[PDB]
Design a protein around this ligand. Structure first.
Ligand SMILES: [Cl-]
Ligand SMILES: [Cl-]
Ligand SMILES: [Cl-]
Ligand SMILES: [Cl-]
Ligand SMILES: [Cl-]
Lengths: 214, 268
């Protein structure tokens, strides 16, 4: 089979910049190469075929070059809606094979998260479990540290985090962290706190609540 | 419009089988091959095979030949002014012989014999998969080329196939209620916690889709219990919290669980 190796695995660049993604085939594919754009949950969109031909509706700031085994996709005047995974596909030979993808991030100016903490609902507590949620909203860059504290004891191993797709207009991220405790443990403690460290914050920021307080 | 609409995906236990369907409409069904492609988490896309609906000939990636079968519906229609016979069509008011497959295959202009054809509308291709294992978990697409010698330009929406021994479970939906300390005249946050479901996926909307600005629906996380959880949040004006209604519409089709959850400031 023809193995397609795409580089880099990810890249980050500012609006208006120019970036290049490379695809290398394990043998000569004679410019039988297509490039696609894919966003999370959405279907692939065909950008380029025959290594350099733009498909309908594709802006000309996308351009494909290359020959032999080595091809390049170049995106100029990078736009915020270009956040996506890009992959190549060779059409020379069966089995048709794809590169592993390149994820593209837009670099924007630092933006601090707005932070919100949510206590567990009474309905959930009937289940015997308590989920505490900390939201970090609309921040950049993606790196961020969330620390949970329960009556000033640091919690470790009992939370999970998720991050949204970089926003296609404002280029921010948002993040949710959920701390899970038994109802019994929840009811034995008073102060629940989410502490957030992020480049846009001068010092870490803590949002807290007291169990049972309206 | 050209549409490929997939269905049939869902949870299957190791060793089991599943048939997916790709309903194609908006173009002459026999004019283009239908391919199947899959995408496992992290891994890149993987081509499975194709079928030519004109001939029902299928060609497979060697990796999948033993376990996967691509097929299409049988055609059973003869054009107007033709009458069906054993396996082909006969033109009304003709009787002479017709030379086997050669003259019972393409329908040349209006011949004495013409092959059976599909009706306009939805016509389907299928992907049958058996002896599934965990590494076959993926989103499965059907897709077709824009034209001969051009790449895949039309894609089915994708259907999720989950190969696992875990049982189906519908989510509980809990409020992330707006804080009583929300800034006067500022911005407040609220949300829905969609907890403990299996398999993926769940969808969330707000106010039946009328509320989209400020919404963030997070990727699910797989908990140590083997169940998924996710959150959906929205920021709104603090001043709207007494008046405007906020309902998250959760749908976990794998368990037939639809929930509308009103989210409001907690009373004391
Ligand atoms: Cl190509
Ligand atoms: Cl085709
Ligand atoms: Cl397995
Ligand atoms: Cl099993
Ligand atoms: Cl999900």
């Amino acid at each position: 089979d023809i193995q397609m190796t795409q580089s880099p695995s990810s890249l980050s660049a500012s609006v208006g910049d120019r970036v290049t993604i490379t695809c290398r085939a394990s043998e000569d594919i004679y410019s039988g190469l297509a490039w696609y754009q894919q966003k999370p949950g959405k279907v692939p969109k065909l950008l380029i075929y025959d290594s350099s031909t733009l498909h309908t509706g594709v802006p000309s700031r996308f351009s494909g070059t290359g020959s032999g085994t080595d091809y390049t996709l170049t995106i100029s005047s990078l736009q915020p809606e270009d956040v996506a995974t890009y992959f190549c596909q060779q059409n020379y030979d069966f089995p048709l094979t794809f590169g592993q993808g390149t994820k593209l991030e837009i670099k924007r100016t630092v933006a601090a998260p707005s932070v919100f903490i949510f206590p567990p609902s009474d309905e959930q507590l009937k289940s015997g479990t308590a989920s505490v949620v900390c939201l970090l909203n609309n921040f950049y860059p993606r790196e961020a540290k969330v620390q949970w504290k329960v009556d000033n004891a640091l919690q470790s191993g009992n939370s999970q985090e998720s991050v949204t797709e970089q926003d296609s207009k404002d280029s921010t991220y948002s993040l949710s962290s959920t701390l899970t405790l038994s109802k019994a443990d929840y009811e034995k403690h008073k102060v629940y706190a989410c502490e957030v460290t992020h480049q846009g914050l001068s010092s870490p920021v803590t949002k807290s609540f007291n169990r049972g307080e309206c | 419009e050209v549409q490929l609409v997939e269905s049939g995906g869902g949870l299957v236990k190791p060793g089991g089988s599943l048939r997916l369907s790709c309903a194609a409409s908006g173009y002459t069904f026999t004019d283009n091959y239908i391919h199947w492609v899959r995408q496992a988490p992290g891994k890149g896309l993987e081509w499975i095979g194709y079928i030519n609906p004109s001939s029902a000939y299928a060609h497979y990636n060697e990796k999948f030949k033993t376990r996967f079968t691509i097929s299409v519906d049988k055609a059973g229609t003869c054009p107007d002014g033709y009458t069906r016979t054993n396996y082909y069509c006969r033109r009304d008011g003709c009787g002479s012989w017709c030379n086997g497959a050669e003259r019972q295959q393409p329908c040349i202009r209006g011949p004495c014999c013409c092959d059976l054809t599909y009706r306009t509308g939805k016509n389907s291709a299928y992907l049958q998969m058996n002896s599934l294992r965990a590494e076959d978990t993926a989103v499965y697409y059907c897709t077709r080329r824009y034209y001969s010698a051009m790449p895949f330009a039309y894609w089915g929406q994708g259907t999720l196939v989950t190969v696992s021994s875990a049982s189906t479970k519908g989510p509980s939906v809990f409020p992330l209620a707006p804080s009583s300390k929300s800034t006067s005249g500022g911005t407040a946050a609220l949300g829905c916690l969609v907890k403990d479901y299996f398999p993926e996926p769940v969808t969330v909307s707000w106010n039946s889709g009328a509320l989209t600005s400020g919404v963030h629906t997070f990727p699910a996380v797989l908990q140590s219990s083997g169940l998924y959880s996710l959150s959906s949040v929205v920021t709104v004006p603090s001043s709207s919290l007494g008046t405007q209604t906020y309902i998250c519409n959760v749908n976990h089709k794998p368990s037939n669980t639809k929930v509308d959850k009103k989210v409001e400031p907690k009373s004391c």
